[PDB]
Amino acid sequence: ERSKLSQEFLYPHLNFPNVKFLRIFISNVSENQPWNATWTMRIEGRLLDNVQANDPAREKFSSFIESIVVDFKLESVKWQYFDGLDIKRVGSENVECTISILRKSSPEEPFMSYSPQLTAIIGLKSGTSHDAIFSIYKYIHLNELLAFENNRNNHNSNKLTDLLSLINSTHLLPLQPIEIDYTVRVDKASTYGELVLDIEVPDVNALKFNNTQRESQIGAA
Amino acid sequence: FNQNSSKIVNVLSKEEIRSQIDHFKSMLSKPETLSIGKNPFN
Amino acid sequence: FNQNSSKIVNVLSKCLNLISEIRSQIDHFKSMLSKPETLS
Amino acid sequence: LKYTKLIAAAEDGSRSTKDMIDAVFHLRYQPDGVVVHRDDPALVGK
């Protein structure tokens, strides 16, 4: 019960893993351009399964997505909360743009993304608050900075334990989005298979089966 | 390991090497893990 | 941990070979990163 | 215990990377949470 939060009991679940895998395609298809201007580009998404596209009950790519932003360098499209998103415009020269894709985050998910000022000190991108606090305390004890502590944590994180334990709380941040740079191809008619990116999405069923079957609860039973 | 890497890079602070130091520090900001899930197709 | 340590050591060896008290520091850093003494 | 030999072989220096991961893994793994393929030889076949 004391160590429910340490990642030692949460990270790998080789018997019942916690994540699904989603694949995203970014493309554009130039058609009937001078050889007016057609400019459609699409963001497609699909869960890797033996499931077929025609079969109903398939999860939509937009089932687990929060925000999609596309900024050109025209006008910028933002989507707030369809298996594909298509954007068709006019113009033929070319454009390069930034795509930001944010994923839905469950409340059952127990991991918080760290800020770059933290993951520099501890080689961990994401963990519970407990892990960050334990590692920071192990760090100040390892370098004999101990109840006053003065250093690298200071210049990185930019007085006492009761002070640091909330500076770190502030350091923890909500899920950050994925950033990609994508260039529309005007002469390259089909840009379909080039940019394929794979991300992992939460599996709520595994999280629910896991948090209700914990060593603490079974031990109490 | 993180402490020593950051230290020796701050000492290497003193073109190609500039972009490479930027790449290194960005990489240190984001280490990689393994994500494991079930296998849909055997 | 193994993979991250390996990648960092490779890119640091590259950056050090590209930049080749200052000279002695660079030599000692080369020697240190050669083997994984950076952990200890 | 089950992994007492895979754990020992990990830190003794032998089986530095690929040998170990293939020994553990049925399940699917990718080398990171987000994997982007800027250009792929097999994927452009679509």
Q: Say whether residue B38 is in contact with chain D using an 8 A CB cutoff.
A: yes
Q: After which residues is chain C broken (C to N over 2.5 A)?
A: 20
Rounded to the nearest angstrom, the minimum Cα separation between B4 and chain C is 6
Q: After which residues is chain A broken (C to N over 2.5 A)?
A: 35, 73, 81, 146, 150, 158
Chain D residues within 8 A of B34 when measuring between CB atoms: 21, 29-32
DSSP output for B1-42: -HHHHHHHHHHHT--HHHHHHHHHHHHHHS----EEEE-S--
Q: Say whether residue C32 is in contact with chain B using an 8 A CB cutoff.
A: yes
Could you give the residue ranges of the DSSP H alpha helices within chain A?
116-119, 129-142, 152-157, 161-171, 204-211, 215-220
Handedness of CA C27, C30, C34, C40 (dihedral sign): positive
CA distance B1 to B8: 11
Rounded to the nearest angstrom, the minimum Cα separation between B28 and chain D is 15
Amino acid at B28: L
**Chains adjacent to B (≥3 CB pairs closer than 8 angstroms):** A, C, D
Approach to solving:
cryo-EM
Cβ B36–D33 below 8 Å, yes or no?
no
Amino acid at A211: N
* Nearest CA among C37, C1, C33, C2 for reference residue C15: C33
CA distance A190 to C21: 56
DSSP output for A93-120: S--EEEEEEE----SS---EEPPHHHHT
* Nearest CA among A146, A147, A158, A148 for reference residue A121: A158
φ/ψ of A129, rounded to 5, equals -60, -35
- A160, burial (CB in 10 Å: exposed 0-12, middle 13-18, buried 19+): exposed
User: How many other CB atoms are there within 10 angstroms of residue A214's CB atom?
Assistant: 13
Yes or no: say if C39 and B1 are a contact pair by the CB < 8 Å rule: yes
* Nearest CA among B9, B33, B11, A119 for reference residue C12: B9
Nearest CA in chain D to A16: D27
* Nearest CA among A148, A150, A170 for reference residue A161: A148
Cβ D27–B38 below 8 Å, yes or no?
yes
- B18, burial (CB in 10 Å: exposed 0-12, middle 13-18, buried 19+): exposed
Cβ D10–C2 below 8 Å, yes or no?
yes
The strand pairing partners of A201, in sequence order, are: A20
CA distance B7 to B4: 5
Q: Token pair of B14, please? A: 């003193």
* Nearest CA among A27, A19, A12 for reference residue A197: A27
Rounded to the nearest angstrom, the minimum Cα separation between C31 and chain B is 12
DSSP output for D4-34: HHHHHHHHSSSS-SHHHHHHH--EEEESSSS
CA distance A66 to C1: 32
**Chains adjacent to A (≥3 CB pairs closer than 8 angstroms):** B, D
Yes or no: say if A89 and A126 are a contact pair by the CB < 8 Å rule: no
CA distance D16 to A49: 32
φ/ψ of A60, rounded to 5, equals -70, 150
The strand pairing partners of A43, in sequence order, are: A26, A85
CA distance A173 to A95: 33
The 3-state DSSP class for residue C36 equals coil
Cβ C12–B11 below 8 Å, yes or no?
no
The 3-state DSSP class for residue A19 equals strand
CA distance C4 to B36: 18
Yes or no: say if A7 and A135 are a contact pair by the CB < 8 Å rule: no
- B36, burial (CB in 10 Å: exposed 0-12, middle 13-18, buried 19+): buried
φ/ψ of A164, rounded to 5, equals -70, -30
CA distance A115 to A171: 6
* Nearest CA among C32, C10, C17, D33 for reference residue A113: D33
**Chains adjacent to D (≥3 CB pairs closer than 8 angstroms):** A, B, C
Yes or no: say if A21 and A198 are a contact pair by the CB < 8 Å rule: yes
Q: Which H or E run contains C33?
A: helix C22-34
